[PDB]
Amino acid sequence: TEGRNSIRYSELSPLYDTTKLYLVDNKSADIASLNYQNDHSNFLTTVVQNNDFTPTEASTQTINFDERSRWGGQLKTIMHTNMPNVNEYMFSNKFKARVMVSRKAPEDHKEDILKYEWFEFILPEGNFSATMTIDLMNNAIIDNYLEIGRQNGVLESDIGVKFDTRNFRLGWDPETKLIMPGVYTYEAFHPDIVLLPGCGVDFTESRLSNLLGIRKRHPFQEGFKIMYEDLEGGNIPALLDVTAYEESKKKIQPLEKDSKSRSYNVLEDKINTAYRSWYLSYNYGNPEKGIRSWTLLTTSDVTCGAEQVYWSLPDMMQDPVTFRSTRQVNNYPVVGAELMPVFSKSFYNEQAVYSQQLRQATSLTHVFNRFPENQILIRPPAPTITTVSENVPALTDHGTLPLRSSIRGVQRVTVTDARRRTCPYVYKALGIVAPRVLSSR
Amino acid sequence: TEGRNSIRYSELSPLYDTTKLYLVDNKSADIASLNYQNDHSNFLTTVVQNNDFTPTEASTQTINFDERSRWGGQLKTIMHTNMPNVNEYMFSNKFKARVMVSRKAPEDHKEDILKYEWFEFILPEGNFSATMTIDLMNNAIIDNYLEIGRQNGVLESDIGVKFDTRNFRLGWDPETKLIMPGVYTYEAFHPDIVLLPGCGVDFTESRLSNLLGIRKRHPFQEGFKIMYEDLEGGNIPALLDVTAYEESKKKIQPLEKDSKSRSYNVLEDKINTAYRSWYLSYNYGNPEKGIRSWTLLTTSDVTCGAEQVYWSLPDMMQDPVTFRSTRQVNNYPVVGAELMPVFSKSFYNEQAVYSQQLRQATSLTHVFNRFPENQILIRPPAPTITTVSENVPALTDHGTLPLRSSIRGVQRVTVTDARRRTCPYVYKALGIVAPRVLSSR
Amino acid sequence: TEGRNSIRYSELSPLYDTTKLYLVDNKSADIASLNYQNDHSNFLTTVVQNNDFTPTEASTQTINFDERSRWGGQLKTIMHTNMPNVNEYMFSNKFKARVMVSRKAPEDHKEDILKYEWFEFILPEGNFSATMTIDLMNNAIIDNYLEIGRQNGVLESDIGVKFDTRNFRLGWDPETKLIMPGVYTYEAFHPDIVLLPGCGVDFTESRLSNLLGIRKRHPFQEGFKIMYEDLEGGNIPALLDVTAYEESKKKIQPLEKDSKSRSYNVLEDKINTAYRSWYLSYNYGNPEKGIRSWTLLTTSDVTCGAEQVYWSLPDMMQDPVTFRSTRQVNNYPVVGAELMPVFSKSFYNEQAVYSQQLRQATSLTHVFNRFPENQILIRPPAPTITTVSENVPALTDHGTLPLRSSIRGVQRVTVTDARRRTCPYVYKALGIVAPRVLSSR
Amino acid sequence: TEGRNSIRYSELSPLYDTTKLYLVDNKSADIASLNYQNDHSNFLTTVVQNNDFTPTEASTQTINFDERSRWGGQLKTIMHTNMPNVNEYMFSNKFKARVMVSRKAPEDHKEDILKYEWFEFILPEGNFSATMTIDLMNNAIIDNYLEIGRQNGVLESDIGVKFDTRNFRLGWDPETKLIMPGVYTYEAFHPDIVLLPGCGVDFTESRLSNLLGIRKRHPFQEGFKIMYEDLEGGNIPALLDVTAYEESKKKIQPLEKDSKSRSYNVLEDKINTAYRSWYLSYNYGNPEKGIRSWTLLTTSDVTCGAEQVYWSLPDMMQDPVTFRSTRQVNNYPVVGAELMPVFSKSFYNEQAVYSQQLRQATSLTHVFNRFPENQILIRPPAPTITTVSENVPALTDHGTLPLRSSIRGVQRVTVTDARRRTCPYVYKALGIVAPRVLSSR
């Protein structure tokens, strides 16, 4: 083992069989000279710590480890990131739906031809919770109504899509098939979608379908769209009229108008309305047809997907097996993998209804909750547990890999995504390599 | 060690005695070609990172490690899951009980033959807390009463089963054997069950018996059912009448009717009612007969059971000892074991009674708490600590195992349950294998 | 190293120098055949994973590792438990005290001979906080008074023992030696005990002395009992009368009767009462005699003692040094040690007085706080921080130990206490052994 | 290996091939003798534990490890620090802006020449949250107005810079281009800046730009300043007058004066005011010109930058490769790197508006929120999640490095910054070195 384990720089003393190599980015010389167009995910840094050499003339010395021995040293990384919840880079603020336009009469409810098209709604970006994002989704539909649908003959009783977090079944007397208290329960179950005949939603090439918790049984197929004609057996039951009920006590019928004459779209029967729900058609319906054979129920996910991240270092380590040696930017043979450092955290406000009753009195006149009298179009209640994403630092150890014989003065580092593109939310990157001796030659 | 440690792919340069092998699932080529019917728990992926080959024609190259040496490399996995609390896959929304039907008079309390049968109640699914699941269990009994028992001669004073979280003994004056304040304590101890003569509950092939905290001393026997005739010495003491007490002060007897004439089923004595409780018969009864010799008292468990999970990988590693080499799906020799990544977390609301007094005023008219005047049938109070499950990622290191000589291009992975079936709630799976050299040949 | 490292089962292929061995308990064949009388702490399981053999006929095959080599493999365990705070198994619901009975007059306060004896109070079991357990201790004294002491001549002013969490000194004007506001401070310091002449408490063979925080300087001596004659220099100062004070302003004396004529047992002087306190005699007294030379002050401990746990495995590993090879159940040579997985957690309610003022208005008429007018017998205030125990899973690595040459098909596992008895609160146990090669033969 | 592995001190027994060496700073002899001018980041300590020698005469003995062998031992450190959020050492309380002075009339809004200059505001230091620092920034502008701007002709309607956390777009009816409720939403989104024509802010050589979350796409360029002429397409829309609206109902125009006649600087149109916002010009503007092509949106960062820290030890370890052996203080060859132990933590107050409505009634008359009637100059609302930094201890393991042959009695330690200067907030430093044997000689 002796003799063949020296580490010569060029003119200093030779070391023996253990050093360290620091890949930092906070040198004050590289900022003005080498790195001028690139950022913390694709920077270019030096290894020599000599400061008799500007880094343009330090790109010539070679730290040549001794030959007749195979070398190789382990890798330790420290990265630290800060990305928001909703952003444009990871496709988290887009969803397209199909809502109604141009309700006009031709020249009796056997008239009024309705029209429909697709839109690709877009909501703002920031770091939000799991409930505030629902209110931002439910604003991207109404500001389409205030632009296009109001000037035509739409009368704000047939919007079509509305994201809600209730169960429209509690209180269903099976003898009369109506809800007894004359109001729906203001309780906070799993979120769902509410449709209307002629509408639908599409979550293809988006990421908000992980936030709601509506997955798919075969997650590799073609795409993910939900129409009105898939929610069979999931109509919301009609609401009993209680102010026209006490004439029997000095008789029973559904309610149709609520203080402003908004129709509930009650059908020809006197049992249920014309609104279909996802959560009510998943377990109160048929476990063979429609839904429950096509999707799956899942808890909410605020960080909306945990993707992997690839470290690359193509001037020190040798290439792993089945990798082509290239200098194109988006191939760069991978030296280690990790997970993206974005976690989740629960908080348990526990009130969630008084804290919603009082919040829209000192902070919010009517900007959210525009329709505070209709029971279906009312604001959804907040859950008793709330979840917010957070960013933590990550300390990792990637094991040993063989390294080259001669190491150049300037070095590249690269931190990529799963689709080979640099993540712009990386704030700090830092690595330490410690070479050892392996088998002889 | 030299010479016999080369790693030849087929046409690239030979490596020496350390590489890495990435088993990812997020390749954009495998989605359209190989994996079309299966999901993240049973997928099929490639190892070659060459991108001159579609993965149908990359299933031919062999990464043959060198012979005349025994190889073997350690394994590191990263999995991430999201399952709800109550679901159908792990038998967490079923329990059967025996309640009453058809109370009619034959042609004096020596009449009215009562009947009884079993039902297998079913409650909805989602992610709930430890108290909201109690209210969902206590709704699956009343909606049977509103369907079958109300149309027969049942008068809603003899329901039979009711899940409660109180202690019906605090305030028991031993001289007069009645409760002095004329009301039970609205305090929040361990949950129990409340029976009535002719009823019972059965938790065989279910999992909700871990949520309540009612275990069994010999947990391997046959099953787990609790009848009325096991709770001997656990009758709830009768409640003293205080509004007919101040006639002595210008005398003592139990109370029978409460503002709506609901009978408390007071016995022939004037001491105790005809309701038996589990918690009151476990420590105030007999430590030899009945209960305390058959069950055990345990804290609540929201995740309801911590089961193990098995990794399988039958194209790279060799088979461990006493395993048969097969290609049936539900045998697949196991390469490592872990724990299912579902934890628990406490929150301490600390109010739990004002936050229950005020919650059913802005959110809930009478949907829960249907009987808000009877002391036994009243809503149970919430504990001062609440517990909710949560899902975290899991980073594991499984040590070294010997691997085969030639590795095919396409590889299988499989993540199973304890009863050899694929868990559908796995969202991300990821592995890294790093081969080393062992003994020679 | 080659040649002498084979692992033959009996009829499969021979492995080489690394396997794994799974000691699971969730096999569906062992439940019906082998394990029928025992539980998760002392079960009996198989190693062969062949399923051509029922485990009664699989107790014959031997996985014989190769001779002429010393073997040995490391151990990894996963255990998961759920025990309550207060229970009978770990002596956490017993304490004996000496209170008063039979105050009768012989035939002037030179009469009324008093009597005293010991009782061994017992309180119920469950999972409670650090303050609710104080209220349960303070109920086990009053229900003795309502049974035996009330029928004799005891007049509920001389109970004798009362667990309190205040400091009865704040507001002591040194000129007049009385408390100025006419009320004690309703503040929430360390808990103590309150005695009365002729009483005492004994915490021998109990565990609640760790919950209060009253330790002992020499913790190995004989036992732990505290009488009235040890608290010298710790009398509570008497309370100034303020309603008979404003006659000086159109004079100073202690108060004796409080709205129901309960005597404070004021002494012959007009300075202090006849109640002694532990916390007030520990630091306001003498640091040489009495207390402060015999006990110690310690923070509260909700889990009440962290005991160790021993793993045993007497069919695979060899015996460690100085252990006798036996098959009695309560010796079983130990293969590794851990800690019991019961932690503590703080919550900081921060109100603790309004949340106590309002709690006994919607939940509690007078069941606790029976005497809500006497200042000494009033309910103690809750601390501003509260602590509750919790149960977490435990992942441990115990290092390497040498194992036997031939391994039988059926195996024993055992998880014991520090006094060699099986803990009944173990819910899941799981181990993995991975053999390696050590020195030759 | 035998023979050549002795460790001779000078006169004790020789050890063999494993010891430990403790670098503590809490010796009571070094405080009075060696360390008299320096602190915990640059102290000077001994290794001999003999106490027959004062450390002035213990700087002569040499713990000479054996020659004809290369030695080297691993390093473990324990450091513990306490730095505030806002301080002077890390440039966290400085920002310069350009506000207005000397509005006087020359001798019709075609007069009143305005003047502008730069100031370098300075705010106090301490440990604050993410919202209280915003209020301290917004006080450093007004106390300039009360000193210089009030005595000239400035009329407190044209301050110019104001840090706000709202979105001034919610409620924008696209038909009339005004905000319908007549008030802005008191909601708590990402923070931004609010400008006025003729002003600007500069965050060069500061650190508060990481607290707001306004990053830059190329983070290496020259500096970071934001003027009014970069925020094109981001004017705040004007506010509709609702008290002059009900004359149509027994008509629509912007509002200009608010109860004290403060002008909103409404433009020649009747659509929008003359205030530009950052958050409203980032996503409602142009994704090609102005902003969104130059900056980036990021969550808040309370610790404001995670910098690295360097351990140095220039009397025991040998120098790593490409380091010059020197005794100047600010070079000192680095033996290991870490991260600064300052983390972040979220708390979720959840009220944030009632807790702001009530906070400025019992604690704050008008010191903050000086203008509680103007909608633009009102106090910004607090977020529903708040983040505070915290300090934790750090336990690290730095691997092995080769050490010298003879070790002197006195030793140096040094803990530096990224710009080679001693951090004054280090409270405890502690290291343990354990030598082993490497290759022979």
Residue numbers in the entry:
A (entry chain x), B (entry chain s), C (entry chain u), D (entry chain o): 49 to 155, 171 to 313, 367 to 557
Task: Quote the authors verbatim.
We created ADDomer, an adenovirus-derived multimeric protein-based self-assembling nanoparticle scaffold engineered to facilitate plug-and-play display of multiple immunogenic epitopes from pathogens. The penton-forming protomer of certain adenovirus serotypes can self-assemble into a symmetric, hollow dodecahedron adopted by 12 pentons comprising altogether 60 protomers, effectively representing a proteinaceous, nonenveloped VLP. The protomer represents a two-domain architecture, with a crown region comprising the VL and RGD loop abutting a jellyroll fold mediating multimerization. The RGD loop contains a conserved tripeptide motif (-RGD-) mediating integrin-based internalization into target cells.
We used cryo–electron microscopy at near-atomic resolution and implemented novel, cost-effective, high-performance cloud computing to reveal architectural features in unprecedented detail. Our structure shows that the plasticity of the RGD loop and VL, essential for antigenic epitope presentation, is maintained in ADDomer. Close inspection of our cryo-EM structure reveals notable differences. The fiber-binding cleft adopts a rearranged conformation, seemingly in between the geometries observed in the crystals of apo- and fiber-bound Ad3 dodecahedron. In our cryo-EM structure, we observed additional density in between the crown and jellyroll domains, juxtaposed to four sulfur-containing amino acids (M131, M138, M458, and C539), consistent with a tetradentate coordination by a metal ion, possibly zinc or iron. We posit that a structural metal ion at this interdomain interface could be important for stabilizing this protein fold. No corresponding density is observed by cryo-EM. Consequently, glutamates E466 do not extend into the cavity, but the corresponding α-helices are slightly shifted in the ADDomer. Rather, in ADDomer, two neighboring protomers engage in hydrogen bonds in the vicinity of the twofold axis, extending from the S61 side chain to the peptide backbone of E59 and vice versa. We did not observe either of these features by cryo-EM and thus wondered about ramifications for ADDomer stability.
